Each structure stands twice: as C-alpha cells, then as structure tokens.
C-alpha cells in the first residue's frame, strides 16, 4: 500500500538472497573475503543469537 516501498522495490538493483547477503557482508566487513553462508549466520548472530 505505498509508492514508497514500491519505489524502493524498483530501486532494488539486486534480486536474489545471496547477492544481498554478500553485499551486506561487503558493506559490513570491508577488507575481508566474502562467503555466502557466514553472511546469513553473522546477521543471525548479530540480531537473533
């Protein structure tokens, strides 16, 4: 129900979970080689563990 979220959903530029995870890992840990599995768990560790 918002053109706000629809505008952001069309400003997505990345479709796919693992691409978003590695982008987060890139922007969170820069200076570090990426791995797609630890990116989902570190986010799970940082907010849910």
């Amino acid at each position: 129900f918002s053109e706000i979220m629809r505008s952001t959903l069309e400003k997505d530029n990345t479709v796919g979970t693992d691409e978003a995870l590695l982008d987060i890992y890139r922007k969170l840990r820069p200076g570090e080689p990426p791995t797609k599995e630890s990116a989902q768990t570190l986010l799970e560790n940082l907010f849910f563990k």
Partner: protein, 143 residues
Amino acid sequence: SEALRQARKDAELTASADSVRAYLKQIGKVALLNAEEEVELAKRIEAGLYATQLMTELSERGEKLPAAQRRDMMWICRDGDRAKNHLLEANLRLVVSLAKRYTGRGMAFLDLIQEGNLGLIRAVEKFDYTKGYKFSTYATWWI
C-alpha cells in the same frame, strides 16, 4: 564473478592505513616450504660459507685465480645468501604466529615482530639439518 574479486582487491587498498596490515599483506606473498627444501637451502648456505672461507684463505697471496672456477665459486658464495634470505622470508609467517600471543602488554606489536625476526636470524644461523628435525622446532626457542 569478477565483482567479488574486484571488491576484495579494491577494498584492501583504500582501507590500508595499518602498517601491520601492510606487513601482513607483504609476508603473504612468499610461499611456505618443506623438509627437503629446507635441507637443500641449508646445504646451499653452508656451501656459500665454505666458499667465502676459501676466498678468505685466498685473500692473502694464496693463488692466482682460475677464471671460470673463480666466477662460479663466487656464484656459490653469493647464491647461499639468496637461499638464506629465501628461508628467512619463508619463516617470517612462523615469527608472526609465535609472536602474536605475547601482545597486549609491555610493548607494541611490530616491535615484537622485529625482535622475533632478529631471533629468527640467529636461529637460521645456528641451525643444523643433520640432526634431521623440523626447522620450526629449533627456531621456536630462539624466537
């Protein structure tokens, strides 16, 4: 696929303000070695030491030098230092891995690294291969 490679190799250059990080990325270049390579490097070093000792007893009025024999014995003399420095650059990572657990007290980290490097120089001087052990075991003491 090249986006992740470009990210991992471009984020390192921008963020590089740490001299420790610079030294780690420096020492990550030279590959490790194994036992027979260490034995061969020790042989080359000892060959260079006996070559420069032969040049030392030459250095008086010992002999007029044969030409090809002179130039390749000086090759032997200079080549042992290459083996020496190669082994040093190999075991820099061992120096770091031993020195890492003494930090957080007394001194800075790079100073401990450099003192461990000097101890590694002393160990690679006084190392023997004929006892047939790993270099790391004998070098850990001096480090």
